[PDB]
Amino acid sequence: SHKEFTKFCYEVYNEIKISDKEFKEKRAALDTLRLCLKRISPDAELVAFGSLESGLALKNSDMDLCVLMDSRVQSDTIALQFYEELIAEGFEGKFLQRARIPIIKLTSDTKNGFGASFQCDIGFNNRLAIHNTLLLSSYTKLDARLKPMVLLVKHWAKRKQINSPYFGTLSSYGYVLMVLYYLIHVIKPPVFPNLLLSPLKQEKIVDGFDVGFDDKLEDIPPSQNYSSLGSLLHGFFRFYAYKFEPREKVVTFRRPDGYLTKQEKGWTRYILAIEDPFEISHNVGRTVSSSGLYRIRGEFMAASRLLNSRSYPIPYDSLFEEA
Ligand SMILES: O=c1ccn([C@@H]2O[C@H](COP(=O)(O)OP(=O)(O)OP(=O)(O)O)[C@@H](O)[C@H]2O)c(=O)[nH]1
Numbered sequence: 001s002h003k004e005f006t007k008f009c010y011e012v013y014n015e016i017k018i019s020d021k022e023f024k025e026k027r028a029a030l031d032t033l034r035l036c037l038k039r040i041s042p043d044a045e046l047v048a049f050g051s052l053e054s055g056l057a058l059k060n061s062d063m064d065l066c067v068l069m070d071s072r073v074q075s076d077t078i079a080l081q082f083y084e085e086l087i088a089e090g091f092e093g094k095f096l097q098r099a100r101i102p103i104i105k106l107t108s109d110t111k112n113g114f115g116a117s118f119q120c121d122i123g124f125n126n127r128l129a130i131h132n133t134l135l136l137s138s139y140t141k142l143d144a145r146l147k148p149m150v151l152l153v154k155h156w157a158k159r160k161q162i163n164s165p166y167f168g169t170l171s172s173y174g175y176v177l178m179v180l181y182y183l184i185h186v187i188k189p190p191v192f193p194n195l196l197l198s199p200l201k202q203e204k205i206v207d208g209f210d211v212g213f214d215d216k217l218e219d220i221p222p223s224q225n226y227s228s229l230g231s232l233l234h235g236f237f238r239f240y241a242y243k244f245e246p247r248e249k250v251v252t253f254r255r256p257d258g259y260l261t262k263q264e265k266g267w268t269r270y271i272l273a274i275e276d277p278f279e280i281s282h283n284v285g286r287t288v289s290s291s292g293l294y295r296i297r298g299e300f301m302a303a304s305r306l307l308n309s310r311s312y313p314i315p316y317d318s319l320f321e322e323a
């Protein structure tokens with residue numbers, strides 16, 4: 001059936017999605033940060049990436065931004081000038097540099113009226129993140145079931161304390177890729193085709209990596225999978241609870257059949273292996289510890305058993321209860 005679960009999923013979705021009010025205030029903040037950047041560098045561009053831009057944002061989400069500029073202009077100097085302009089405009093935050101890469105982390109706004117807890121990361125020439133955002137955004141436009149599924153999965157992982165990359169578990173971006181991997185390579189018939197492996201895909205090289213994918217979306221047939229949101233979600237929990245083998249296999253978007261061993265890849269950290277679709281040398285689940293994977297798997301298992309429970313009424317609310 002899944003009819004009652006599907007209705008429940010849409011109810012939670014509507015409550016957890018970013019409201020129009022917040023989306024418009026984030027867009028106002030971006031306009032303001034663009035003004036500050038203009039004052040310091042008229043040639044540079046400020047762009048948004050991540051879930052706000054791909055349309056996969058929950059209420060009260062952080063902002064992910066990137067300054068694009070000529071690569072012959074050195075990034076740390078403009079980063080510093082931008083940072084100083086932001087501080088002078090009443091933003092609070094930190095300027096830092098890991099290796100060669102400068103980063104501004106804004107944690108507050110004291111003047112412009114965007115909040116005491118305005119949270120915004122600003123990277124410099126992070127072109128790959130823009131591209132992986134274009135990808136996720138394309139999938140979001142290809143099937144209306146993607147957005148609510150992702151939001152629910154993210155909300156679930158937050159509630160269960162398995163969405164903490166600094167504490168041994170997995171980034172939200174890692175969960176989005178796990179969803180996508182399920183929708184492309186696991187479910188039958190597929191919800192999505194693999195856009196990177198399309199015969200119509202044109203190579204595009206950016207910072208060493210191929211970021212090409214078929215983006216002519218209006219020529220792609222609709223899915224021949226007709227599952228409700230509830231059934232999709234139950235399938236997803238089931239696959240990562242019982243079928244996926246994290247010790248041996250890699251979540252990937254580079255194989256026609258989605259099959260890849262950690263060994264071929266050289267990924268013996270690698271407790272959980274998710275190959276980024278573009279930056280194929282980057283394991284997105286590298287933050288996942290041995291205990292974190294246990295808890296992640298335990299929660300996939302618990303979600304599966306709840307949706308499979310023969311004891312009615314099924315307490316669906318418990319899917320989003322704080323572990
Ligand atoms: O390993 C990573 C993680 C992050 N990213 C890039 O950073 C973006 C934001 O990474 P997040 O983990 O914040 O994704 P999110 O926006 O969906 O999660 P919430 O903040 O909503 O909790 C991602 O959408 C991707 O563009 C990477 O490219 N690689």
Ligand SMILES: [Mg+2]
Nearest residue numbers: 050051062064
């Ligand atoms: Mg984010």
